[PDB]
Amino acid sequence: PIELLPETPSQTAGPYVHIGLALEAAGNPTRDQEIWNRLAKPDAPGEHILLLGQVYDGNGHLVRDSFLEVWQADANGEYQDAYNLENAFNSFGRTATTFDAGEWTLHTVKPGVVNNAAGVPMAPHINISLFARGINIHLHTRLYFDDEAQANAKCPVLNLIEQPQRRETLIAKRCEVDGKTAYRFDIRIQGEGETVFFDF
Amino acid sequence: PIELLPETPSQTAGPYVHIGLALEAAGNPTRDQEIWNRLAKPDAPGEHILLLGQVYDGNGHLVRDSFLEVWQADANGEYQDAYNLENAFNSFGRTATTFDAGEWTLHTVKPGVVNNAAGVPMAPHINISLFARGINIHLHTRLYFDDEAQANAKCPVLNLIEQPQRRETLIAKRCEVDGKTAYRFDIRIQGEGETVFFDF
Amino acid sequence: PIELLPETPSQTAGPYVHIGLALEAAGNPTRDQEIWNRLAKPDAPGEHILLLGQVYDGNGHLVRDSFLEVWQADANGEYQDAYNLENAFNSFGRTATTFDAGEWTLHTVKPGVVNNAAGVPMAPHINISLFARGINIHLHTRLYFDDEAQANAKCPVLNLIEQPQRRETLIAKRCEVDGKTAYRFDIRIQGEGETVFFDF
Amino acid sequence: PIELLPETPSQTAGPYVHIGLALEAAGNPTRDQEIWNRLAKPDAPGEHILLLGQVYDGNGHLVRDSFLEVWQADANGEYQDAYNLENAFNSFGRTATTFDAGEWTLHTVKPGVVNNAAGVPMAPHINISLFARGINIHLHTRLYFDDEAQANAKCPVLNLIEQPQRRETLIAKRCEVDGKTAYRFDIRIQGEGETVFFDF
Amino acid sequence: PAQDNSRFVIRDRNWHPKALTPDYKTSIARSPRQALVSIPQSISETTGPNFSHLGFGAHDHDLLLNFNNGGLPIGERIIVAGRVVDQYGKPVPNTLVEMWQANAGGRYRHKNDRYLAPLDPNFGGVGRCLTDSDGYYSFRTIKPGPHPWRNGPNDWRPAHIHFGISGPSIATKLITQLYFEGDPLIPMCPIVKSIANPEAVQQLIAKLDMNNANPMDCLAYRFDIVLRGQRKTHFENC
Amino acid sequence: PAQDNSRFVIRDRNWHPKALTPDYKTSIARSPRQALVSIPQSISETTGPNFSHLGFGAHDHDLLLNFNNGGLPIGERIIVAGRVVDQYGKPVPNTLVEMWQANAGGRYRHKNDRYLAPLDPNFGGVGRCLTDSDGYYSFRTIKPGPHPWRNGPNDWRPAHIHFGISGPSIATKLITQLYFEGDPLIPMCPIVKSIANPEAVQQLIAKLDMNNANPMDCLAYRFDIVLRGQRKTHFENC
Amino acid sequence: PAQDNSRFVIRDRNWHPKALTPDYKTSIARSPRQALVSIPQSISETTGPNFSHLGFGAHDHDLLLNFNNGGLPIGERIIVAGRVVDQYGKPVPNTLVEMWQANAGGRYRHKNDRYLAPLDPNFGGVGRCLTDSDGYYSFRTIKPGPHPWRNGPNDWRPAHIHFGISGPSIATKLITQLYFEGDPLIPMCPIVKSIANPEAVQQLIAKLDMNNANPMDCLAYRFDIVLRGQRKTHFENC
Ligand SMILES: O=[N+]([O-])c1ccc(O)c(O)c1
Ligand SMILES: O=[N+]([O-])c1ccc(O)c(O)c1
Ligand SMILES: O=[N+]([O-])c1ccc(O)c(O)c1
């Protein structure tokens, strides 16, 4: 058969990933511009929300050295790919779990709906890639929102998950953090309540 | 790189290990001198203690054919390697789980504190090697004591176990058996509450 | 390691090199435009100089079939690569030793100072490549000027020659030929007073 | 045939040999004890002499980074092999050429006569081993003395040199340095007056 | 804004390391036990950030100068350069390449690294750049030392530099590690060996590149990176 | 009392059998699912019992006479001998070597063995001795018969003798099994094959040793044992 | 005093590098053009200094501590150890072993080295010791970096440590260089390549020695040295 050049194989990001990708957290000085966890200037169109979560290993223990990259549509359902700290909104961001509480946070707006390749609307979602010590190749997931139940029920991607119970692992829970709208999205890498991870 | 002679590879001790190493237990006559489960004659210095335990597989079922070897300092924190059944104290002993109840027992003294190679005190401990049918290479663990909480908290070996929860699996529980001080030390080879096993 | 395409290997120019590269000298008719030994028309800025020299083998005998290529800055210390026989000055020229006397000549201007890659001034120099029968790969050398003693002493290239004595082999001797300023530059390929040859 | 283990191959001592073997000269602090160029305490039996020399390459230029080891009998013709800075005399020493003048010096006594393996007396000699950048395997030679002409004429080692003229390369010239008895032993590595070098 | 106009070759997850590779101990509890769920590519997966407009500092790519506290870092001066192409051999221009590493002695400037080898006051350990219009990147740095770590009782990472590459989409984004030609620690590392196929391992080994060295100055290593092949859509929804 | 003055080469746990080897069915539920925790060697690990003053009976090493009930056991008379050395090739003198096995028919003298092949009234199946000052040990016994066992539906242990060796510390202590040259059951046994590397399997196979046989009497097999290399400490805490 | 009582195997001067090896440029003018003159061994050549009574400082063998100016040197912590034997395989005990090297960045602490890589304020670069009664030596140091040098326009020494070994006589005394397993600069070096036979080159390459490493501390390299075989005289003068 036709065989292309092989892709460069993945390796773990390792425990000191912060030195390269999360400078403040590693304990180091930051450069003038950093790619980080504030996707929206206060000005940006849409409903401003806080996202936060903790990450659990197969033993139910906090993964305190996780590194997360996110990609989401803006409030108007447009992917803003021209990354710029001067942008009202960036579709891309990065975050990491604090070593003490093991919690990451992201400041964003709720994404608008986009269609899949067949033209079917997907429920509002944030694409997530999870990296850490002990993770050889990053894990893909999606965060959807519990106050979008009608959309989530019809999502052509959620519906590819064979078991209804596993779809629940992807639905972030609306709550309030310091009085502000938030959604909690905990990730369980392994075992009971294991988060659905995707290949594409 | 430099490659030495390879070590002879381990194999299971098998179900009939008692015939070679725990003669009574096999249903067999003993020889004049046997290496067994009494490390201290009643005259030995130190606090005299009964140790006991059961061994569980990954399904929570008793491992009734376990063979255990132990190595511990005397009450003064010194290892006594000159094995001799005349001694008031031997640092080495052997025991096995009864086929009926699955319980092993040792009769010994509480070991004194020993420093690690960097000179840091380790909490009082007994070194255990566990052998059985289904165990291809023996499992190393340590038995520490629940009435040494201050020393356990500071043990350089305990503190190499990354999760505090797992440290608990190595703390034997003080009780009384027929008026005499005793400690129960159950080992779970696999699954919930899995005992920490060492490589060194 | 990374290995590139290998360079086409050098070979001797051979005794009849003149037929390809110095047409007069071969006893042959010239074409309309030839690359030859006059780098400066009488109108060129700078001090007009005749250069001449003989070439000796390791037995002190004249090398009568030498072919030389030269590359030099104009009087203002700039290299002029747009070769054109209309130019008042060309930085490139060619010459050859007469079969009878063994002497080559060039007509040029004294080059101005050029900085090395670190910004340090080099003493006025002409780059020479020498080709001949018996020379398998051409020999690189430099012609400097005996009336630039202060600059020669400070040249970063001259100072890469470890022995001061050998530095002398690259200093051309000012004289007068028929009232006009000239410099003699003899090259000794081998043995006593061997001319310094470069690799770069 | 019988083939033994091969000897570890030699490599040049390199230009910075002084760091390891001539600390002061490298520009570095010395340790409490150094193996160096004073073989004799003022007390030592025998005629106290100074040895000095310069080392020349094939171009007649000073080898300013030479390192020399010497081995000689004491005044009574005994080899003192138990090296000790408290000894009245050490048969072994080290020296090196100064970088400015390229001259080494050694403070010693004139050696007494020893016999070769056949019982024939050798003329008074110092065994020398020369090391330097560009010297792949060290060069062995002997320094003999010009005021021992009768002995030198009969030396069974000097007489192994086929040409009388080459024997002269090994004869140090008695002179005076600051009014004290000395012998100069210049070494010519290559070319005219090349010093005899030995294999044994 | 971004558009869905391409598809990316499916990953070979037997070429990449699998999730569960128990010799690498932390992988045991941090690997899923359920199968990944395959999903078709949509705009969500086939687009991603472009960093053309990110503001890079003058020394962002140069670890010899980007943590300057009065001197140069101690260690083997090296250029690490190479090309980012996709599996079709197409160059991947204007793409973000990030790298981070320990100092010459295997010490990381991270508060969680307590290895006894000293920090270097003039070495930070992070670099970033965009590939040029032809897919080439370059960094200047010190060759990192082996780093011991608590896996087995005597485990040592080979000299390595961590790499992250964005590429054209979130589907192409990759984190990996560069190793150095001939390092005898490579066959011994449980993290290297998380990759089952030795030919895949070979793709992570940078080669000495004398052609790219600065004489009397710094050596050079070449490390090329291949991202998933990108193609146009064809015959979809018909 | 014992002293911490040596260190033992780290085990290769891919050379040894792994814990989880499912064809050997009992290992499935008796293997840890968490990684082993590596700890540095201390006096706890680098010391161990010396048995020089354990009192051995006259026939403790001689299974032909140590279960004498009025006759000799039936079966192939053999001497089993060899040397105990460490990985540096140093002999391991005065070390405890214990062994146990079935009779000539594959029947163990243990209440839990109900195999239908009879016991031998003059055979017990246990021996012990110390290595001598040059590291050599010797037993006399009957060659054990293959033993059927409830693993797969037709599984049979090759002829085998169980071995335990103390060595200089609890870190060197080893239990293993000896197998016999040419036994065609060896490649089929899921206990043998818990060892992944066939060169490691080869290290458990005793060789027919005609040189050590007593003519008209008994054959002999040679089984050498390698314990972890022991070296002195160096450059510690400095 | 010293006695003539042994003879040393004649050197193979095609195994050693020859004097004239023009790719190594300085060798051209510093090689003899006349043949060496062979002489028989006498007391002058078969004896030499013994350094048992030389006074060694506490850190003479430990480059991590012997130039202490307030901290540890930056770089890959390594033990370099091995055995000195003669060509008959006999250990050479109580013999002087000296070594010197550049720092982690290929800079020498010598006033003539103007390479732009910085000096390390806590690294000197010299070590010495005597072999023990079994012929073994050991040093602790930082792995040296490649060093560029003015030979060809882009020439770089591999990582190397210079060694001098005295042995039992001036006939055995040797200076050499240690190189490191797998270093891709080794085949390219005109000084390495002064040795014509690649098998001779192999004898200068130290092997990674994990067995000798201190976990969480320092790696180790093994470098054994073979001096000329020493034998008794026989049938001389008869
Ligand atoms: O635990 N890990 O994954 C590690 C530990 C050390 C490293 O240098 C690394 O790159 C990864
Ligand atoms: O289950 N096992 O492990 C067994 C069963 C029979 C044996 O003879 C043995 O050595 C091991
Ligand atoms: O002496 N040569 O160099 C020669 C002689 C004849 C040739 O045709 C040539 O190319 C070279």
Ligand SMILES: O=[N+]([O-])c1ccc(O)c(O)c1
């Ligand atoms: O010129 N040499 O011989 C050299 C130059 C640099 C070196 O590091 C060396 O060992 C030798």
Ligand SMILES: O=[N+]([O-])c1ccc(O)c(O)c1
């Ligand atoms: O792996 N096996 O099964 C083996 C390996 C070596 C042998 O000599 C053998 O008889 C069997």
Ligand SMILES: [Cl-]
């Ligand atoms: Cl936790």
Ligand SMILES: [Cl-]
């Ligand atoms: Cl000179």
Ligand SMILES: [Cl-]
């Ligand atoms: Cl820069």
Ligand SMILES: [Cl-]
């Ligand atoms: Cl004995």
Ligand SMILES: [Cl-]
């Ligand atoms: Cl020390």
Ligand SMILES: [Fe+3]
């Ligand atoms: Fe790392």
Ligand SMILES: [Fe+3]
């Ligand atoms: Fe058995």
Ligand SMILES: [Fe+3]
């Ligand atoms: Fe021709």
Ligand SMILES: [Fe+3]
């Ligand atoms: Fe060097």
